[PDB]
Write a protein that binds this DNA or RNA. Sequence first.
RNA 1: GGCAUUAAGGUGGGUGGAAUAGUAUAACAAUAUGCUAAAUGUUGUUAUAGUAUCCCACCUACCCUGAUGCC
Length: 236
Amino acid sequence: PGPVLPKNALMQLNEIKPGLQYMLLSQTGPVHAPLFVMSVEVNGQVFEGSGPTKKKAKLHAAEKALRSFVQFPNASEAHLAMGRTLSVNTDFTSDQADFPDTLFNGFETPDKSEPPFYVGSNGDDSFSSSGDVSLSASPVPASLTQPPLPIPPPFPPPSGKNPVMILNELRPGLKYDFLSESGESHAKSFVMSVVVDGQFFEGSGRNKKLAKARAAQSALATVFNLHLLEHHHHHH
RNA sequence: GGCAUUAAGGUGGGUGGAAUAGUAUAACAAUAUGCUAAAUGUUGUUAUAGUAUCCCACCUACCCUGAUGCC
């Protein structure tokens, strides 16, 4: 239907509030996933809530203490004739609200190019199947819109710019890999590859920096629908 | 065969610099709940800071290749 807001628990607490008290426990963790546990006290009942940042913590705390407090807005008696326990009858289930979507078929080109389409006496294994794999990605199919190579066509490397950061600051939502060399310590030719939005790029060089500058340059221009050698003053 | 000097490239480590990210602290205003009043909440603007992510430069060590000289 739509989103929700804490203003409910906030207003409601503000109403019931006879003069309550908020506490802040924990508050420790990494620099980007800190945990705060705020505990809220009314009439001697305290309820603790664990959220990132103080907002959600105090919120959940307020909710709990609200629901408890509405049953003890005042007191004059107590007992011990009650308690609580645990269970394990929930380690399994019999219902859901979602479904799988994984692959179930796949194929590979039977030859260096597409097979005939006007004959029936030049083979015996290209008209009696439609797939042979569903658990791998080793095939090398095509789309008649780009060469069948595992890589896009060649591109010119940079000569003073550095596309690794531009890309890693316009769309850092990628991953990179590094690939083999071709010498002992001289005439070396290392390479890097990348995967970006699902596409794949690669680039070689005399060192790891130059190789990433070519693989990145390729990834940037293609995925950003832009280029790197057609301007030089877009900013200053 | 060993030794000296000179030069090119690559790799590891250390140091320094920059950008991005989330959180936190502090100030100001507005908006909301009550408006008897108090208090609190929500949002906006501004300033500051440990860290994490990533890059760049410098320094050092190592590896390797070229050139020349001596024995």
